């Protein structure tokens, strides 16, 4: 049972949709049980986000109608260029028209009453996948293979009520998909969306189609979950920084998870978790170079003699230093810190706390600084004679995080020392270090201006060897 997922850019145009349809058709020769998961065409979701906001504010029925023609034509052309049989094209066009009719009504709605509930947001956003899936399923039928398009809910992904960033409540993938697969039908499931227990359309957060693939792979006890993207697997680092970056052939579930940082574009660990749990191999493949071997993610670790496997970076960040003697020992300060931050929906990327307990260092994203400062002065006040426990809160802007990653780091005596000497030699100063006890990830913080020289140095010393 192969689960094949395709991103916005993989299905970014009619031509590209047919191309993935071929990829899928070819795989149905090998594995007889294939489920595809598809994302909205590229930039569609972004357009749906923007139009959502621009319907709430500046209510303009005509501006909506213009967007509707844009979405209509992009998809009409997608059908025209992806499917050859006029009979299929007719039937898929009918589905698309039904959807746009709906999308239009809701968008007029949010404009008319000037309200955009998270429920409504989720419904609007979902139209992306609900537009691409019938096209791909049509193309798969055009290539002479049985296929129907399904929604996340219909496929058995039942979620909580947390609109926009919903988590799975329970799975019914087997009940919903096995019957289809029995008739040799290739269901193309809309990634990114789910249904709530009561039936309302839900979204799983941006990049959610990857997660959908993982859950379906999970429910079906799949042999493999194939992520089809626009790069040849996972690279040792971002090629925009180091052009000599190379494809990583094998990756452990844990190594994969540590490469995942909050924001990217990487496969969030949430996606790895189900595969890790059942030991279902993940294969990251390049849609635009389908013969590349890509990246296999498996439990069959082994000890491939190399220590450092990859280098990750995060550039949009800020470093917050929280301090006061007031804070050492059995004080709820730590609990209170992350409470105030939890309230403010402010993500914490790094935490370091040295032996004195007089200090906690955090890295958050640039845009969350004021939100965090305001959250802290809420929980506190910012002298010792006043109740207040925190004495001084410091902010450090224009920084980055670097992570050095590899299972081979575990026993590796001297690796920390070698890493940081290299950092020094590249001209960067090490502002904060965080190495968890798994020893797989050494994360550290430097000025953003030094990011490029540092990665290039680290890459040369530990990857290029
Ligand atoms: N519609 C989804 C596509 C994806 O997850 O790749 C999104 O914009 O996040």
């Amino acid at each position: 049972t192969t689960v094949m997922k395709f991103g916005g850019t993989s299905v970014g145009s009619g031509e590209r949709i047919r191309h993935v349809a071929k990829i899928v058709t070819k795989r149905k020769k090998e594995d007889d049980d294939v489920v595809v998961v598809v994302s909205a065409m590229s930039e569609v979701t972004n357009a749906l986000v923007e139009i959502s906001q621009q319907a709430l504010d500046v209510r303009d029925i005509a501006k909506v109608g213009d967007f509707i023609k844009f979405i209509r034509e992009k998809h009409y052309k997608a059908i025209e260029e992806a499917i050859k049989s006029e009979e299929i094209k007719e039937e898929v066009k009918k589905i698309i028209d039904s959807r746009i009719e709906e999308l239009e009504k809701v968008l007029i709605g949010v404009a008319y009453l000037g309200e955009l509930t998270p429920k409504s947001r989720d419904y609007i956003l979902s139209f992306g996948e609900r537009l691409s899936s019938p096209i791909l399923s049509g193309a798969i039928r055009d290539l002479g293979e049985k296929s129907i398009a399904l929604e996340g809910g219909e496929a058995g992904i039942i979620t909580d009520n947390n609109f926009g960033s919903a988590r799975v409540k329970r799975l019914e993938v087997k009940e919903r998909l096995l019957p289809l697969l029995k008739e040799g039908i290739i269901p193309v499931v809309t990634g990114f969306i789910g249904t709530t227990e009561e039936g309302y359309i839900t979204t799983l957060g941006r990049g959610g189609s990857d997660y959908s693939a993982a859950l379906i792979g999970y429910g079906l006890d799949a042999d493999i979950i194939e992520i089809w993207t626009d790069v040849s697997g996972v690279y040792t680092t971002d090629p925009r920084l180091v052009p000599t970056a190379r494809r990583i052939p094998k990756l452990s579930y844990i190594e994969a998870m540590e490469l995942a940082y909050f924001g990217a574009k990487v496969l969030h660990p949430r996606t790895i978790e189900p595969a890790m749990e059942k030991g279902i191999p993940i294969l990251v493949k390049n849609t635009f170079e389908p013969e590349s071997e890509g990246t296999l993610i498996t439990n069959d670790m082994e000890m491939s003699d190399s220590i450092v496997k990859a280098i990750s970076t995060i550039k949009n960040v800020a470093l917050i230093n929280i301090f006061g003697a007031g804070m050492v020992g059995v004080s709820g300060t730590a609990a209170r810190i992350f409470k105030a931050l939890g309230e403010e929906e402010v993500n914490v990327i790094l935490i370091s706390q040295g032996s004195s307990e007089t200090n906690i260092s955090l890295v958050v994203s640039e845009e969350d600084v004021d939100k965090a400062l305001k959250a802290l002065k809420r929980e506190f006040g910012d002298s010792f004679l006043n109740n207040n426990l925190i004495r001084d809160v410091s902010v450090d802007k224009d920084v980055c995080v670097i992570s050095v990653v590899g299972a081979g780091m575990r026993g590796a005596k001297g690796i920390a020392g070698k890493i940081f000497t290299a950092v020094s030699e590249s001209g960067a100063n090490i502002k904060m270090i965080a190495q968890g006890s798994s020893e797989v990830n050494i994360s550290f913080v430097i000025d953003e201006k030094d990011l490029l020289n540092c990665v290039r140095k680290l890459h040369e010393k530990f990857i290029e060897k």
Side-chain angles (χ1 to χ4, degrees), residues 1-409 411-418 420-429 431-465:
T1 306
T2 302
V3 175
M4 302 174 76
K5 180 264 172 176
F6 296 87
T9 73
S10 292
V11 294
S13 66
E15 198 177 309
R16 288 179 179 192
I17 294 159
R18 194 167 180 86
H19 176 71
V20 12
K22 279 158 194 199
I23 291 173
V24 163
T25 286
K26 188 209 169 194
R27 187 70 85 268
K28 227 272 182 185
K29 294 259 282 184
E30 293 143 45
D31 200 327
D32 191 38
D33 293 13
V34 177
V35 177
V36 3
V37 171
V38 76
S39 303
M41 300 180 73
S42 52
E43 302 295 317
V44 172
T45 310
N46 285 335
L48 287 155
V49 176
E50 262 44 67
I51 230 309
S52 287
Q53 206 60 51
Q54 298 304 79
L56 178 69
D57 325 310
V58 283
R59 319 160 175 194
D60 194 17
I61 314 152
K63 171 77 162 57
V64 164
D66 276 8
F67 163 84
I68 236 72
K69 207 153 85 68
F70 158 77
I71 218 84
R72 186 192 303 274
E73 289 189 353
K74 188 205 170 77
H75 287 93
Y76 276 172
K77 191 148 89 172
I79 291 163
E80 192 88 339
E81 303 201 270
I83 301 159
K84 222 283 160 69
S85 160
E86 299 285 345
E87 197 170 330
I88 312 297
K89 284 155 73 177
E90 169 79 312
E91 193 214 320
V92 170
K93 177 175 177 284
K94 221 183 199 282
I95 296 283
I96 305 316
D97 295 333
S98 280
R99 308 290 156 254
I100 56 93
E101 157 106 22
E102 289 166 12
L103 208 216
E104 206 183 56
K105 285 157 69 164
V106 62
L107 233 65
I108 309 298
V110 49
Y112 272 12
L113 93 170
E115 217 153 38
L116 188 66
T117 43
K119 190 166 162 290
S120 300
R121 260 207 84 101
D122 263 29
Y123 193 64
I124 294 166
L125 286 201
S126 76
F127 278 93
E129 276 69 17
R130 290 160 65 201
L131 289 170
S132 58
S133 43
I135 309 182
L136 180 54
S137 185
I140 292 177
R141 271 177 271 117
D142 196 41
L143 287 168
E145 211 85 48
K146 282 182 273 184
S147 174
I148 63 159
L150 277 196
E151 278 172 33
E154 302 176 77
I157 298 164
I158 287 93
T159 65
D160 49 37
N161 285 3
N162 192 65
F163 296 109
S165 52
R167 266 175 140 272
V168 189
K169 185 138 130 56
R170 57 189 191 84
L171 297 167
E172 292 180 339
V173 189
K174 284 172 275 161
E175 292 87 349
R176 309 303 288 260
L177 289 181
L178 260 21
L180 266 39
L181 293 172
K182 179 60 71 159
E183 307 293 83
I185 299 167
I186 309 169
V188 327
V189 180
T190 55
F192 177 62
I193 69 169
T195 203
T196 199
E197 198 72 78
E198 48 282 1
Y200 310 134
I201 296 297
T202 232
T203 63
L204 314 169
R206 304 291 255 105
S209 296
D210 285 329
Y211 185 43
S212 311
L215 299 156
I216 289 165
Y218 182 91
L220 298 169
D221 283 278
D223 287 321
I224 196 167
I225 298 160
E226 287 170 21
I227 278 76
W228 285 84
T229 182
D230 55 23
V231 289
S232 287
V234 193
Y235 277 75
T236 54
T237 191
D238 194 46
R240 318 199 262 93
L241 285 28
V242 175
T244 40
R246 62 160 91 105
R247 173 182 63 84
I248 305 173
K250 283 199 178 183
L251 222 38
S252 81
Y253 294 115
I254 296 164
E255 285 174 335
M257 287 197 194
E258 298 267 12
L259 285 178
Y261 57 102
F262 196 79
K265 315 300 171 177
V266 280
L267 284 179
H268 37 298
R270 192 172 58 161
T271 304
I272 287 80
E273 190 185 24
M276 184 177 69
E277 188 141 308
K278 288 254 187 66
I280 304 164
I282 305 167
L283 185 62
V284 182
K285 289 208 71 137
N286 198 343
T287 293
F288 307 101
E289 198 216 325
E291 281 307 306
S292 173
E293 229 136 62
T295 291
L296 189 58
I297 306 160
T298 40
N299 250 103
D300 85 325
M301 188 157 281
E302 334 158 81
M303 264 288 198
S304 60
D305 79 324
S306 70
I307 300 179
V308 178
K309 201 149 283 204
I311 298 107
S312 295
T313 52
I314 312 160
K315 28 201 254 66
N316 296 346
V317 293
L319 175 61
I320 305 309
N321 186 56
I322 305 179
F323 160 85
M327 284 187 46
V328 333
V330 287
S331 71
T333 301
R336 286 170 65 188
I337 302 282
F338 307 105
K339 172 171 268 196
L341 264 25
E343 300 179 346
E344 216 64 40
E345 234 76 279
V346 168
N347 173 56
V348 46
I349 304 157
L350 258 71
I351 315 172
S352 176
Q353 192 252 243
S355 61
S356 61
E357 297 154 66
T358 66
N359 271 286
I360 303 175
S361 292
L362 311 163
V363 38
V364 301
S365 92
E366 280 257 341
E367 75 222 294
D368 286 329
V369 166
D370 311 348
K371 300 189 181 298
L373 280 161
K374 210 182 275 70
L376 289 169
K377 60 200 258 73
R378 160 103 306 179
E379 189 71 23
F380 305 98
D382 289 349
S383 184
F384 57 96
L385 297 164
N386 45 302
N387 204 314
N388 222 225
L389 293 151
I390 287 167
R391 250 292 315 184
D392 184 282
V393 62
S394 205
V395 47
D396 212 311
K397 296 191 174 195
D398 278 323
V399 298
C400 63
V401 176
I402 294 160
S403 307
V404 176
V405 169
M409 262 160 51
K413 284 171 177 173
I415 199 64
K418 285 180 206 151
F420 300 119
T421 293
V423 186
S424 151
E425 285 168 329
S426 86
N429 188 273
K431 300 172 73 67
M432 173 189 177
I433 307 164
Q435 191 208 94
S437 75
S438 77
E439 289 172 64
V440 191
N441 179 313
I442 289 173
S443 299
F444 66 99
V445 167
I446 60 160
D447 291 343
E448 196 187 334
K449 67 162 196 81
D450 298 303
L451 171 61
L452 192 81
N453 288 326
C454 183
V455 187
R456 286 172 176 186
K457 182 74 172 194
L458 256 20
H459 195 269
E460 187 180 35
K461 253 71 218 298
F462 304 112
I463 303 300
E464 300 169 40
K465 280 183 264 70

